[PDB]
Short mmCIF file of C-alpha atoms and ligand atoms in Angstrom, two decimals:
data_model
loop_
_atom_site.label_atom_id
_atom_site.label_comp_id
_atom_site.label_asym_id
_atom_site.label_seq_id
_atom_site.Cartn_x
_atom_site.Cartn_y
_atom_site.Cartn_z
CA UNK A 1 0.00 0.00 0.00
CA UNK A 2 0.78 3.67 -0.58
CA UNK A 3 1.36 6.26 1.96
CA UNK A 4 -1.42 9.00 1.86
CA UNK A 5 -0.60 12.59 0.86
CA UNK A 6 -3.41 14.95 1.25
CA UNK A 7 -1.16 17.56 -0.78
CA UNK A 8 -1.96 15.56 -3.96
CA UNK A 9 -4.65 13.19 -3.31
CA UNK A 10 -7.95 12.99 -5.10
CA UNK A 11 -11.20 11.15 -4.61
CA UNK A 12 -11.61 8.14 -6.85
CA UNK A 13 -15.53 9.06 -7.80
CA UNK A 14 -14.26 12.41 -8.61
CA UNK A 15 -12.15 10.97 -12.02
CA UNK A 16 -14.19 10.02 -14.97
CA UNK A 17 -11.80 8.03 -17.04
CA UNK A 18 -12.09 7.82 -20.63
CA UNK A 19 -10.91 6.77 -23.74
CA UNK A 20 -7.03 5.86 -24.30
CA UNK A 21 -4.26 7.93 -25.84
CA UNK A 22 -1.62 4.97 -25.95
CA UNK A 23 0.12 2.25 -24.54
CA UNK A 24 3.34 0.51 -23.98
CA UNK A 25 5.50 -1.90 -22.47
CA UNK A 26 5.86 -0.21 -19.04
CA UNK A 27 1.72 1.61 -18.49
CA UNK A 28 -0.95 3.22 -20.68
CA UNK A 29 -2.25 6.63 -20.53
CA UNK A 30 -6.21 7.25 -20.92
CA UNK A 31 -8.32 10.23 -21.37
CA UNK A 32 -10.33 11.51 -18.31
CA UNK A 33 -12.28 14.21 -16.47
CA UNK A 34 -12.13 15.36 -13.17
CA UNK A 35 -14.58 16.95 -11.17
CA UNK A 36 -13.84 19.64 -8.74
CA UNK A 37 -10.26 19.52 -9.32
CA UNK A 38 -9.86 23.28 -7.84
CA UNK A 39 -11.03 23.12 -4.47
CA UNK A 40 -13.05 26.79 -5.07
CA UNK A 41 -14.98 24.89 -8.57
CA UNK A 42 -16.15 21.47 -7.16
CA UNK A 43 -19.32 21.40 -9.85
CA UNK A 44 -16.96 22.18 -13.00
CA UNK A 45 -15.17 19.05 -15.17
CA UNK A 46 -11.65 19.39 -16.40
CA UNK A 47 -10.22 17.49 -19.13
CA UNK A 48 -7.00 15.83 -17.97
CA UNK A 49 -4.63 12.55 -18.50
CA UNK A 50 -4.33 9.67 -16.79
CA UNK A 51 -1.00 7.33 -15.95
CA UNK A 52 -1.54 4.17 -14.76
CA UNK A 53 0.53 0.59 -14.70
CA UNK A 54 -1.20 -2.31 -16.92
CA UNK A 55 -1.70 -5.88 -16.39
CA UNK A 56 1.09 -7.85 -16.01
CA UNK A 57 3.01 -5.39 -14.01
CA UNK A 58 5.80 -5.95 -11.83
CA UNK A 59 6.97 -3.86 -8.77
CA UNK A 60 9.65 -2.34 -10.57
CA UNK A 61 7.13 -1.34 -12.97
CA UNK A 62 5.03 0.40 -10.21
CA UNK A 63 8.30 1.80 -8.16
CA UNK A 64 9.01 3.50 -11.48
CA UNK A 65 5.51 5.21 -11.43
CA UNK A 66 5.68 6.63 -7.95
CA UNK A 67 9.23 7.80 -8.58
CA UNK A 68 8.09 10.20 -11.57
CA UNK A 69 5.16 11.15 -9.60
CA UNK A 70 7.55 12.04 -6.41
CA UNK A 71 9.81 13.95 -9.36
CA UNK A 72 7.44 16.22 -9.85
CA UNK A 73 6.20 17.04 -6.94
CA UNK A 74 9.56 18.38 -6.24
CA UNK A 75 10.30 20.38 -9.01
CA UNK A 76 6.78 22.57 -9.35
CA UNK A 77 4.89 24.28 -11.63
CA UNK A 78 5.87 25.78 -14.72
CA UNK A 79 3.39 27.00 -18.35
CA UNK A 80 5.81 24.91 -20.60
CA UNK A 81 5.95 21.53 -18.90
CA UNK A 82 2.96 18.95 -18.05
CA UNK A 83 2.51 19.89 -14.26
CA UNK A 84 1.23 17.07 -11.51
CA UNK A 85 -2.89 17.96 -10.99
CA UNK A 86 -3.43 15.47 -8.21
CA UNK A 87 -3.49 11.44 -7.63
CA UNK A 88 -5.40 8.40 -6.57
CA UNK A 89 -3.09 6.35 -4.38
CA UNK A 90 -5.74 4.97 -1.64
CA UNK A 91 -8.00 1.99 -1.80
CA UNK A 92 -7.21 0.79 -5.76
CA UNK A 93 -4.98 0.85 -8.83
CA UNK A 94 -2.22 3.92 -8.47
CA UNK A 95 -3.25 7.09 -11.27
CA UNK A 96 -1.16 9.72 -11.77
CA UNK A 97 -3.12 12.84 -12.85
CA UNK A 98 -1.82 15.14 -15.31
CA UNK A 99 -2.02 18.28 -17.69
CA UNK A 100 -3.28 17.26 -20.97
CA UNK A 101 -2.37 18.26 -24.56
CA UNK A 102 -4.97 17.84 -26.98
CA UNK A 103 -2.93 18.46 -30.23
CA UNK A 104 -0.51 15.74 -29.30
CA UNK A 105 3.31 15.58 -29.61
CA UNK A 106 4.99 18.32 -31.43
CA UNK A 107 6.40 16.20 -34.25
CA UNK A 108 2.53 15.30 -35.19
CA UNK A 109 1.56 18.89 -34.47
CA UNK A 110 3.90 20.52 -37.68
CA UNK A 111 3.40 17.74 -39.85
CA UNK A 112 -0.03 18.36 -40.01
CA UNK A 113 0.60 22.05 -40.83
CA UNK A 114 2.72 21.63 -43.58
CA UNK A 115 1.98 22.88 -47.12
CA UNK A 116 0.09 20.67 -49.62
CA UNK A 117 1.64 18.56 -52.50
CA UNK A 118 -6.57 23.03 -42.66
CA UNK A 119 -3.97 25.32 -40.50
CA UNK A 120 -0.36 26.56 -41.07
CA UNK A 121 2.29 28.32 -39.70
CA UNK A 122 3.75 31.52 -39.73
CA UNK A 123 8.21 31.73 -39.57
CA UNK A 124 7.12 33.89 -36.06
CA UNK A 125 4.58 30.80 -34.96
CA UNK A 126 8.12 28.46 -35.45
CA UNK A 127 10.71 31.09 -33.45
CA UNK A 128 7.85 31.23 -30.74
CA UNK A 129 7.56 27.63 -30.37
CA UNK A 130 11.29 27.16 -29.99
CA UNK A 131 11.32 30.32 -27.59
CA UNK A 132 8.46 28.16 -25.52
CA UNK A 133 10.39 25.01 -25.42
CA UNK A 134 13.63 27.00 -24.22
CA UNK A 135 12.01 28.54 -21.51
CA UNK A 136 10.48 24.97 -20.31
CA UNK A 137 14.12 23.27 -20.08
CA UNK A 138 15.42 26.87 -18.42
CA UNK A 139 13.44 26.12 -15.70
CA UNK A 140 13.45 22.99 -15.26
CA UNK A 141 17.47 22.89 -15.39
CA UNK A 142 16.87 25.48 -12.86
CA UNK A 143 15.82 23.00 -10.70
CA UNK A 144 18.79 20.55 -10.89
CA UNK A 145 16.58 18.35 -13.61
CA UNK A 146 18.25 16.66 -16.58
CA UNK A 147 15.90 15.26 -19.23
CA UNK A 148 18.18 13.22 -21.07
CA UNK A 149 15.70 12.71 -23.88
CA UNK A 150 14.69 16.02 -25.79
CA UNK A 151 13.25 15.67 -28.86
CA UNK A 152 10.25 16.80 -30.52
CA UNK A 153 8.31 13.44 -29.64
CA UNK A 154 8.51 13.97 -26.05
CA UNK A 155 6.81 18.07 -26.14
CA UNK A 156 3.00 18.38 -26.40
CA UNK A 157 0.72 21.00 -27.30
CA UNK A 158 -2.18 22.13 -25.75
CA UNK A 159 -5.14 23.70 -27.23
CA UNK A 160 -4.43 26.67 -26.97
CA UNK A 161 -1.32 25.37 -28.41
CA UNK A 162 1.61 26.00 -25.75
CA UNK A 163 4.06 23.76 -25.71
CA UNK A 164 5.20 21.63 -22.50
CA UNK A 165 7.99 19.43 -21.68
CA UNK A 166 6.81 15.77 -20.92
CA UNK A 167 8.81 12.66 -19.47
CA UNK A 168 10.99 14.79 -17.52
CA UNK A 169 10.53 13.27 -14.54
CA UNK A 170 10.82 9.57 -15.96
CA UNK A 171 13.17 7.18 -14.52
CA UNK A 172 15.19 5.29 -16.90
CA UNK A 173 18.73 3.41 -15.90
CA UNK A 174 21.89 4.19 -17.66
CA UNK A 175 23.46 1.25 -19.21
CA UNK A 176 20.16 -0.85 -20.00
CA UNK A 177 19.39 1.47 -22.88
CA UNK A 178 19.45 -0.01 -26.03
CA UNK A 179 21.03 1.71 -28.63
CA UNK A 180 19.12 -0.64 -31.42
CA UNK A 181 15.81 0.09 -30.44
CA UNK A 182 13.46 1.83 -32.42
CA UNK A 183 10.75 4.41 -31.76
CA UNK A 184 6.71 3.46 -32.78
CA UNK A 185 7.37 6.07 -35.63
CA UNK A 186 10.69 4.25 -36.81
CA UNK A 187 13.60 6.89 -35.66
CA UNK A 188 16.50 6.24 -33.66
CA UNK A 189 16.37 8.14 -30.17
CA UNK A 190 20.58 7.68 -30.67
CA UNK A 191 20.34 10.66 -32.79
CA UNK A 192 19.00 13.29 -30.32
CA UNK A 193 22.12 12.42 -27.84
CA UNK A 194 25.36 14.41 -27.54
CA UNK A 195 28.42 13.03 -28.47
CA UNK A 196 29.70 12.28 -24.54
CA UNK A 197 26.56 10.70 -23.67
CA UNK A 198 26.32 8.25 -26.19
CA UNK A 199 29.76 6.96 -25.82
CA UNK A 200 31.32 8.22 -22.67
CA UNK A 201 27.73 8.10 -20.57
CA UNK A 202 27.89 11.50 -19.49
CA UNK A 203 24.73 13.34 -19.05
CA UNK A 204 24.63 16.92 -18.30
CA UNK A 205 22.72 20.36 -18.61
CA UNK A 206 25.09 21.00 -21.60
CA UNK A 207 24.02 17.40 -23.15
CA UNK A 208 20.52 18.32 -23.21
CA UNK A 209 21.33 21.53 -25.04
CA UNK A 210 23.06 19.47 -28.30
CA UNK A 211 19.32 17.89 -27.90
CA UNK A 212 17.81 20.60 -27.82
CA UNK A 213 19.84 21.66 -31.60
CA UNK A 214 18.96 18.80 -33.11
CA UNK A 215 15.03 19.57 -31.73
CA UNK A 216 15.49 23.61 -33.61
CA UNK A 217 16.23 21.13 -36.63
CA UNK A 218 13.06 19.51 -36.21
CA UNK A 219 11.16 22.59 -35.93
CA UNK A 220 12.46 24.05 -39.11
CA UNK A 221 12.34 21.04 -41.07
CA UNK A 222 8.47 21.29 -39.80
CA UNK A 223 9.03 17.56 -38.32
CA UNK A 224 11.66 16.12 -40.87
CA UNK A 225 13.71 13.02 -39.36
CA UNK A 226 17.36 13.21 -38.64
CA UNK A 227 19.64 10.86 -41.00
CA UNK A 228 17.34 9.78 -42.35
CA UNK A 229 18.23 5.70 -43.59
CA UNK A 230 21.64 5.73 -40.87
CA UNK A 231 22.09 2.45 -39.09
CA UNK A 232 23.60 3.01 -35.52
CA UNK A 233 26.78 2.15 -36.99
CA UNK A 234 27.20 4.75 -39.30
CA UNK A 235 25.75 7.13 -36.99
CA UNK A 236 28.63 6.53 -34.50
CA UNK A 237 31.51 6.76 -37.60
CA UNK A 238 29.43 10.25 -38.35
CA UNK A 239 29.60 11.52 -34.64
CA UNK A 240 33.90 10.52 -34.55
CA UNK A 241 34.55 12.38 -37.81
CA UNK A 242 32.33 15.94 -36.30
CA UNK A 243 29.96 15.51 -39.11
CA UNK A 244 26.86 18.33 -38.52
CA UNK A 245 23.58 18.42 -40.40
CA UNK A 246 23.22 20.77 -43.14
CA UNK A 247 21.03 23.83 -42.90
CA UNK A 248 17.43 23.37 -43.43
CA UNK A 249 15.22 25.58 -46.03
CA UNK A 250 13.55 28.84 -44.89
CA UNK A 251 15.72 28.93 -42.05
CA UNK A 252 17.61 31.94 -41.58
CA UNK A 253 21.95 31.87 -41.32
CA UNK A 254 21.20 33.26 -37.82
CA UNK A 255 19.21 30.29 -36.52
CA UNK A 256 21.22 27.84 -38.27
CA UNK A 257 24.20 29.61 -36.34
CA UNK A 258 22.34 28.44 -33.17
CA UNK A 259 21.98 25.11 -33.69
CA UNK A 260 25.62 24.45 -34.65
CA UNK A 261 26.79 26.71 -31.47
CA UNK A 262 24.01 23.54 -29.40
CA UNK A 263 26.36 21.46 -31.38
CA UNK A 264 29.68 22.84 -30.50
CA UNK A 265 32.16 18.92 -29.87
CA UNK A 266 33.41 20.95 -26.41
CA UNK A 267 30.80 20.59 -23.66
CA UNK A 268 31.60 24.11 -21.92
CA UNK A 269 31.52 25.69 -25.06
CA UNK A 270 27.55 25.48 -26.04
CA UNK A 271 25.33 28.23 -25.11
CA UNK A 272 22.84 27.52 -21.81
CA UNK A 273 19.53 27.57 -21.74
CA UNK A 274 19.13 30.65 -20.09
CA UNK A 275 21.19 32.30 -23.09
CA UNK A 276 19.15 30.34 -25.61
CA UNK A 277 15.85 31.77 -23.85
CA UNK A 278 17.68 35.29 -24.16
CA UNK A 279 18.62 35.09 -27.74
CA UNK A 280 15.13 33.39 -29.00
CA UNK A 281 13.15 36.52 -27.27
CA UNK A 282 14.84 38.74 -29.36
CA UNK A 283 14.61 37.25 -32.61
CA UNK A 284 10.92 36.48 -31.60
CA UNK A 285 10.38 40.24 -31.67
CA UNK A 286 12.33 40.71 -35.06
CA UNK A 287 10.85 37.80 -36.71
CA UNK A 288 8.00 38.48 -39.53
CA UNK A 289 4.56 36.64 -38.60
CA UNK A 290 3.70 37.91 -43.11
S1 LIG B 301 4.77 5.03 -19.37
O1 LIG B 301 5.74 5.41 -18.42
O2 LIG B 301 4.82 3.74 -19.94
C1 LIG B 301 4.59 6.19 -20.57
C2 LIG B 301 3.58 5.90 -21.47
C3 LIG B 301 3.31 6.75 -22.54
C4 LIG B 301 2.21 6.39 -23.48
O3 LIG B 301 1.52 5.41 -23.36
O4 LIG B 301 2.08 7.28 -24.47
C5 LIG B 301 1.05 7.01 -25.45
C6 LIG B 301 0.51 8.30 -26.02
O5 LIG B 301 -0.03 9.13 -24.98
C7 LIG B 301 0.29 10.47 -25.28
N1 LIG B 301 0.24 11.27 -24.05
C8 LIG B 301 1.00 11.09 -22.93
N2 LIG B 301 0.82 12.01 -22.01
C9 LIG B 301 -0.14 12.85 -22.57
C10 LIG B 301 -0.76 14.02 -22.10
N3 LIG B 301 -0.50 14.58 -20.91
N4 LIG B 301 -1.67 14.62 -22.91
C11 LIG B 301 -1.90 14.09 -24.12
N5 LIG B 301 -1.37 12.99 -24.66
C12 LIG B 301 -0.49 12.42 -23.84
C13 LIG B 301 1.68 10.40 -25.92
O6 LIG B 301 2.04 11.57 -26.64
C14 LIG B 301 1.51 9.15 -26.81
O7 LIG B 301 1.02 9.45 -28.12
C15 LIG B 301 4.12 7.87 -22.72
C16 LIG B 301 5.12 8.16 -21.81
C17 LIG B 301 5.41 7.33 -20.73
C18 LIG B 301 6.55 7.72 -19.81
C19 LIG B 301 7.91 7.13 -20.18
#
């Protein structure tokens, strides 16, 4: 059994759980409303998501679940991440109650808006969504937090489409990674990692920036995949030799610039977040929304 904690807790009549957005080999996520969430608004439904474990679960499974939950807890509340709405720990299965993002993962989000061959985006819409995603990892490597995963696949969008920072929190063991495996849309998450993590297994703030680069290439390439058709092989032989990705279309010399200076082979080197947010609020500002 779980320990109560009447910070977070919710009432298990209160949840009205739904239909599924996805599975996987560890838990499933469903769709869900809550009622009187916001102690003030107890007659008033809000649309939220649900974690939970799945059948044949083991205790490792569920010890990973409480962990993420206890993550977040910790670190607070911030506009561009999925913040922790509450929890049903007592008398049943364990749920996890979060912020939900109705226009799914970012990668899904601009290939849906992308030109024909029902909504599009403006080159100020794309500088704004990178500004939003820099601001989410400032503050979250504020608060001591390494992600270790950024990519475009693991940032959602709301309706009123903000983007936030999921899986932060998520507990995943260095050295049991494997390198082979795939993603459900067929990419290799061995692209996204900096050089030093993916061979000397060094994660850092300044790892999580050449992530974030490769994630300003996804943006401008409105979702494209990064080499494309390289085995993990050739990726590695790539990565030795200081091979970088050539500069998308419609993408200005200036934010091009950027993502090689995420990319720079010397850790200390690379720009922080807190520069990145910096230099993304000015070119906001400059940028033409025509
Ligand atoms: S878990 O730890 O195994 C886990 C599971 C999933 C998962 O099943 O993802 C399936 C789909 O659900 C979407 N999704 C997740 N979270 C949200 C929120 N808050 N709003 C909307 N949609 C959401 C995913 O984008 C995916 O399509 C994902 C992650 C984990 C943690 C490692």
């Amino acid at each position: 059994e779980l320990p109560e904690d009447p910070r977070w807790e919710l009432p298990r009549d209160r949840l009205v759980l739904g239909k599924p957005l996805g599975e996987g080999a560890f838990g499933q996520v469903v769709l869900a409303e809550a009622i009187g969430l916001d102690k003030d608004k107890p007659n008033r439904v809000t649309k939220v998501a649900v974690k939970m474990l799945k059948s044949d679960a083991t205790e490792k499974d569920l010890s990973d679940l409480i962990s993420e939950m206890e993550m977040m807890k910790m670190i607070g509340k911030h506009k561009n991440i999925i913040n922790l709405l509450g929890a049903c720990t007592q008398d049943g299965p364990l749920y996890v109650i979060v912020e939900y993002a109705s226009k799914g993962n970012l990668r899904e989000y601009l290939q849906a808006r992308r030109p024909p061959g029902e909504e599009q985006l403006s080159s100020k819409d794309l500088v704004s969504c990178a500004y939003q995603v820099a601001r989410g990892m400032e503050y979250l490597a504020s608060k001591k937090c390494i992600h270790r995963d950024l990519a475009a696949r693991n940032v959602l969008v709301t309706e009123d489409n903000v983007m936030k920072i999921a899986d932060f929190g998520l507990a995943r063991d260095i050295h049991h990674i494997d390198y082979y495996k795939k993603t459900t849309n067929g990419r290799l998450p061995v692209k996204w990692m900096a050089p030093e993590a993916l061979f000397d297994r060094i994660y850092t703030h300044q790892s999580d920036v050449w992530s974030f680069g490769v994630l300003l290439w996804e943006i401008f390439t409105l979702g494209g995949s990064p080499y494309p058709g390289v085995p993990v092989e050739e990726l590695f032989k790539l990565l030795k030799e200081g091979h970088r990705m050539d500069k998308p279309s419609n993408c200005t010399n200036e934010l091009y610039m950027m993502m090689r200076d995420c990319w720079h082979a010397v850790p200390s080197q690379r720009p922080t977040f807190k520069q990145l947010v910096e230099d993304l609020d000015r070119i906001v500002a400059l940028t033409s929304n025509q």
